[PDB]
Amino acid sequence: MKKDIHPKYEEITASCSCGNVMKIRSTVGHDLNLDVCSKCHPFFTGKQRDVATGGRVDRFNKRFNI
Amino acid sequence: GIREKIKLVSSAGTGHFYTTTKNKRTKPEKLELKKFDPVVRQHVIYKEAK
Amino acid sequence: MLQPKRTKFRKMHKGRNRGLAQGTDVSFGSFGLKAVGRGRLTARQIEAARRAMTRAVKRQGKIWIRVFPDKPITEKPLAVRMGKGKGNVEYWVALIQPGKVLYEMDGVPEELAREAFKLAAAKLPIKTTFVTKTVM
Amino acid sequence: DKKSARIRRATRARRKLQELGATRLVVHRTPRHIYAQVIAPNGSEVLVAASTVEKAIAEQLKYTGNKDAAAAVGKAVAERALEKGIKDVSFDRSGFQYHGRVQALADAAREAGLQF
Amino acid sequence: AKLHDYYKDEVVKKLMTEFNYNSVMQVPRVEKITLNMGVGEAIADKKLLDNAAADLAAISGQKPLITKARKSVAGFKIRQGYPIGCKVTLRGERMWEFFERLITIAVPRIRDFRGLSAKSFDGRGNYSMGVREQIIFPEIDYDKVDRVRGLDITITTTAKSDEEGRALLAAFDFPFR
Amino acid sequence: ELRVYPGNYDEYMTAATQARERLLADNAKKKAQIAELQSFVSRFSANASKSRQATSRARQIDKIKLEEVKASSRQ
Amino acid sequence: RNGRDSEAKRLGVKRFGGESVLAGSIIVRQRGTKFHAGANVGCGRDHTLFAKADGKVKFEVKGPKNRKFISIEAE
RNA sequence: CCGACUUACCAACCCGAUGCAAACUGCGAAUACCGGAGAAUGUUAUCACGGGAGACACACGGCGGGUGCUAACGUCCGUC
RNA sequence: UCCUCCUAAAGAGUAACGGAGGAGCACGAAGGUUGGCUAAUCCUGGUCGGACAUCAGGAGGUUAGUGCAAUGGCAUAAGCCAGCUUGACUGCGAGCGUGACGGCGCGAGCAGGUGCGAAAGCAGGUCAUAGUGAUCCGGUGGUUCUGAAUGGAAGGGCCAUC
RNA sequence: UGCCUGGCGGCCGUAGCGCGGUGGUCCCACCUGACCCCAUGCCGAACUCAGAAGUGAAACGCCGUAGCGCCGAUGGUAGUGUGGGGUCUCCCCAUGCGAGAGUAGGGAACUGCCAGGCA
RNA sequence: CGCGGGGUUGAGCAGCCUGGUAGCUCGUCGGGCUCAUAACCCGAAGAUCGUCGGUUCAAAUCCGGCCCCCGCAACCA
Ligand SMILES: *C(=O)[C@H](CCSC)NC=O
Ligand SMILES: [Mg+2]
Ligand SMILES: [Mg+2]
Ligand SMILES: [Mg+2]
Ligand SMILES: [Mg+2]
Ligand SMILES: [Mg+2]
């Protein structure tokens, strides 16, 4: 490095809402809590559940009260 | 044309001067170069005047 | 007509015309009109002879024009004294040496290409001859 | 590449030494050893050669290829050349920066009796 | 670092068995990560280039180098020497740390997650990627931000084949398709 | 340049105004009698049999030579 | 629009190979550096190769790029 | 939007073949020219200094060329 | 008037109201030295971003670059960055090139004092060739050289310069 | 003496590209780490320091192969010096010099001074 | 194509005089006034500064090329 021209880089312990303790270094200095990381991300079900809107056939049939 | 003449009078005390041309638009301040003064035979500072 | 679309310089020296030619063999077609004389040959005599070639076959066969003018020829106007500059470019000529195969055609019977070349050989200012392709 | 870009970095001062007709002390520096040799002005035949790959300087040194090792080989050539009658040379850099173990080679050779 | 030791422990074995190598120094490994932003316009707001460099430095704790126009291209009214973008090259510990802290928390924060394409290769085994915005990194706190400036990340590895470059990043749990 | 006008503030005002206005009127006269002369020089000086009748005026435009006018610093 | 030219500069080799030159004598007046300075010759700011020690000129071809070099024999 | 299609039409860079150039050269003479050694020949034919000049309107013919119309007993150069 | 190419006939030179382009500058760094660096142009991958801005890899090889027109050059770079600096020195100069002359150009080395570099070394302006005008007359500065009886002085000379 | 490697040259494509293979005891390269001697218009990537755990992958060296690059006859052709001639804007004869391109082919270097390791 | 001039909103003209600002008169469009047109009052519209280039941080202005139009000239015995 080049003698204090970079932003300060120190170890922080950023945790997720699902626990997920990680020992990382970042130029924040204040601990951060955020949403689910890729350690527990729905990367296999977050797409299979995305298709939910569409199809008025069943909406018509549920309106078939007569 | 635009670059006109100046003279670098000697600051060793004697009457001696080199001659040069200087662009007076870009540089508004004097010239300060160490140049050989043959009357005293040593390298002194040479300010500009006219 | 024919003309260099672009030229590096406007006018060119008169120069000379010596030695034999380099395009001496029929290489594209099968019958060619080989020059036998010498002397510059204009760009109006290229088209006035190609028009006779394309009219005698009437549709048949490709034809190749194996020569290109690319040589400006100046000419002082009338009633003007000499000097006071060079002339004005008027036309373009192709310096032709003996042996230079001018035209060649292909796909037609020999006895018909002989007649098409003979009709086009009468619009040119240099002696020509008929030559057929060889195997070398 | 690092050796083509270093031989190019050396061709400037190599040729000036040739046209001045000067016997030159040429160094080659390796992460494992360091070599030095005095070369005749024609540049073809060598006179003095000493390096840390030599089994006469290998065991005296704790490790070949540091500033301490370069200092020892510096005294090797300087004494070797003096017994051969060569007192003036020119330090050929070979493209290596005159900064580290290369500098310690010249300093030991210069102080030991060689003049450049 | 953490990902460095993960690599040297297990990914070496994984790739060795998957590609029947015979030497340790033959397995592809990541060599550098270069992340840049070409701010496009700094001639108008010369300070916006400074702010973009500040954003990149916040994202990765290294002062960016300001890369200037190479040739005076006439299309966008620039000439030689104009500052055009900023760039950071990360190697070693900083490389590994940024790689880990990207792939763990920065990637999932993209809106409408899909998984990064597998055809984003130059043909020599080096990966490239966009982000479309920089807020997804934990280093921007919605205060100084005025634009939605993004990054362009190139992970350059010593892989000598596109397939090997695929496998190297696949073995690291990359969000692929 | 500093040129000293004796008097008072109003005296300087009237003096400066009057002198500048007379200069910008001398300029008008010189411009008029230069443009008229140059018209004749352009008409003649290429005629085949009357060419030498523009050269008594080509040398006279060279003698009017309107004086240098420098932009006023007021703005 | 034409008719302008410059006085000839009198370039070219002055002392050809085999000539016994004195010291400091000009050998080649050049414009670029077509002949490179070899042994016992110099190169002025004008690129004019001049003998640096008397002897006999020698033209030779050497170097990676087949350059033309001028030397001198110490005779 | 996507280009969804279609082109009888044009077409750069490249690949193979054929040409041209005073202001093109990855090639390249004959002559000419500079320097050195050697005989024969030539009333020094060479150089330098000094006294006296004349001359600076050239013409044609062969060769190499500009301009001209590869016209002129035309015009401008190089060499005999 | 000066510079570059061709005519110019492979040493130098060579004309026309022959064919083509430029000059009447710029620069206290665009000079010196030391250290470092290497282009154009297309191919693949990516946020805006597209034929072309920035980034990464490869092919290419100087087809880029040079303050300014052309030719000759340049990788050891003469092309691109950075540190320190004023040799953009004073007196000379063996020996040459080119001029009818006036003059113009190249220059190793010597003496005095510097600069860069560890040192060998390089530096008397810039990659080179254009960017310029003689003499007379007069101006400014220095200088016991002279000073019309003698001491001064005016006025001449000499050096730098307009 | 023999082989391999390293440095400095000679010589400069018959000597350089491309394809296949090969070498780690010594040597070379990659390589581990870096507060520090030093460095990055940011980055120990480059420069530099301390040392050896691993590999010969990359590079490099070496060997084999003609797919390129490269070299290249003999004969003829063009040109031309001197002397003659023609139907003379172009040529021919005697004689001296004699290319360029292309063809058959050659061809993936040779060598010197030191210093190591194993012979 | 030998010497000058200008090309700016629909028409005729300033702005080019030493780079930052696209304007004036009439005209076109929509309202109001009037029995209706004209005149008159209110509001807005439109122009790649002839066209391609170069220094420029910027151009219309400065420079260069190309086209269009408007004036002179192309001699005597
Ligand atoms: C003009 O040239 C004509 C010539 C005839 S005189 C013998 N007349 C002159 O007066
Ligand atoms: Mg006379
Ligand atoms: Mg005469
Ligand atoms: Mg004559
Ligand atoms: Mg005559
Ligand atoms: Mg006559």
Ligand SMILES: [Mg+2]
């Ligand atoms: Mg000549």
Ligand SMILES: [Mg+2]
């Ligand atoms: Mg000649």
Ligand SMILES: [Mg+2]
């Ligand atoms: Mg320069």
Ligand SMILES: [Mg+2]
């Ligand atoms: Mg250097």
Ligand SMILES: [Mg+2]
């Ligand atoms: Mg320089």
Ligand SMILES: [Mg+2]
């Ligand atoms: Mg120059």
Ligand SMILES: [Mg+2]
């Ligand atoms: Mg007296």
Ligand SMILES: [Mg+2]
């Ligand atoms: Mg006096």
